[PDB]
């Protein structure tokens, strides 16, 4: 199978998305992969190779290699990845993915530098359930994921680096629409500073909280540096009226932050309205944001995404 994309972003403008599969390989079934996507702020080339194990759809291996830089906001990162996965379906729709990450990453936070590696276990759970694939009319989608590294064993720092999000969709009377979204993460460590981008957290964005910058909602360094946050959280809800065939009118709330104490998460809030287009290049959505806390302005957001 092959693959071009284009897109455009207000996050991270004009991009190109590439693929390009090699569906059979040999006898076992193997499978090779390539995949690619620039723009402006960031810029990614990966590989993969895949073996079907047995089931052959829901057990398999797939090893990956890549490589990301990343220069966003006011910080810089060069990440280099290898990884091994096991891929698990029991009925339920319950996806386990065992994991083993390794890789090292060159980084600046602030004004200031790194370079780090490690080699990381991780465990995740997905369940996807939806009634149709260009119509869902109701749905939801759970995503745990559990990552840690252990100093000594390959790794600069002790590392607990937990994420989740849940979406969810209703629709009711004759066809309007209800739209839920959670995300909150978290990583412990007893070694914060050797701590690289790629593990620390940031919000605000198209699908995070709108209103915002992208990755501009974070903690800030004795020197006034949004270096990143030891935690996250981001909820959103939409609501979306029918307006046509392929039209739908959406007005949403959001609340998010990045921050590194519990006690103040300094939640901010966006609110706003926007169209919806299902257009034979994919869904695109056109906001306009009014930002309430902090010194908030009105934004413009583009995005094409589900
Ligand atoms: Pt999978
Ligand atoms: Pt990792
Ligand atoms: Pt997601
Ligand atoms: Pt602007
Ligand atoms: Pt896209």
New binding site residues.
Partial sequence: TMGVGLGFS?DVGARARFNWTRHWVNAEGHSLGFESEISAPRQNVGAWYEIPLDPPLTDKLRFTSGYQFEDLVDTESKLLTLGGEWHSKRPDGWQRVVSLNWMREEYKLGDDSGLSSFLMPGIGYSLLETDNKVDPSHGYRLQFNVKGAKEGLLADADVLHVDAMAKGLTSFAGGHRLLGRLQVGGIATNDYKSIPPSLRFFAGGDQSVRGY?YRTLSPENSDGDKIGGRYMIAGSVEYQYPLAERWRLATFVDQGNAFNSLDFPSIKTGVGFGVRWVSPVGPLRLDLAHALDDDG?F??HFSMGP
Wanted: no cysteine.
């Fill in positions: 207000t910058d302005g934004r413009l």
